[PDB]
Amino acid sequence: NFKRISYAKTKTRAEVRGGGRKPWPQKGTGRARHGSIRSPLWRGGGVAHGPRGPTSYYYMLPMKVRALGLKVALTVKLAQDDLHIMDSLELPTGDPQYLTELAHYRRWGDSVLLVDLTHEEMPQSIVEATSRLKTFNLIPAVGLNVHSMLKHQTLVLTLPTVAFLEDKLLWQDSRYRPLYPFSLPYSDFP
Amino acid sequence: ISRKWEKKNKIVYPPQLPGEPRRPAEIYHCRRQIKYSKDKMWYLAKLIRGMSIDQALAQLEFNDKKGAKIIKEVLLEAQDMAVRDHNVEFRSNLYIAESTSGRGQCLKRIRYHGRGRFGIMEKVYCHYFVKLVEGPPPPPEPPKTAVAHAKEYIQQLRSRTIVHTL
């Protein structure tokens, strides 16, 4: 819900082109009582209670809650035998056929989230292997969240990647107050 | 717009067996877009109903209305198509089984009253349906005499039994 911008917009009885004078006298004729056209009760008017302009559902959760959610997702993926730790994500020839055959032989499922680290330090074999499939994805260690993990069935990590995740999740515990944003150089925090 | 009355003349039946009756014929025909009223067409159909085709033609030839000649021509062309295509040899061995009227597409016009107001002139249109069946016309249902009423009353008094117990 934090990336939702509803562009739905409907005009009311005032923004509709039309309706100025008074159609028929109220006391004269014996018709219904009306003062102007282009009303929500007439044909061709505006919406009474509808979407008025772009509505933004922007709201942020605490950083500790998000870190705890990440840790909970990791525990869920580890307990249900859906977390395979690797040492070096490399392929001999780099092809989707060998990749999906290995995935089916090692019993993983219909989807798996391959996570590396530092983005730039990624070999070309696995990149070319995943660039031809839809279920296989290659995201860096920073672009790891919860929806991508819950969408896939298993998760694949690496020793430096899992170490980075562990230290980044433990940095939230035993720290100081925010006071000012962490984008500053600080002294101990890089 | 729906047209399902002119297509009933194309229902093909399987060949019968020698141990089966003759089975009378069924001829369907109707016209569309007729400048007339549905009430008068229904009155004419009620005048016809189940009678002979020759008697119907005789009654329509001396009927002082607008749709009388229209229904006469309809019956004439239906009998012609029956004796030419529906395999009918006798021209006087026909009788009308079903005869009703419908409603046609209508327009809207003005009436011009005696002030700024007016009316909605709706061009009334109708149709006419008729079905021709071969063989002699069936006799009308005779009225039940006192014997039938007496037998029915005896049956009703004999059919009643004990109620509201066992």
Binding site: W24, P25, K27, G28, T29 | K108, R115, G116, R117
Partner: peptide
Amino acid sequence: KKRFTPPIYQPKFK
């Protein structure tokens, strides 16, 4: 007073 309302004519498309 002399109360009176003028009639309204419908468009010529109906």
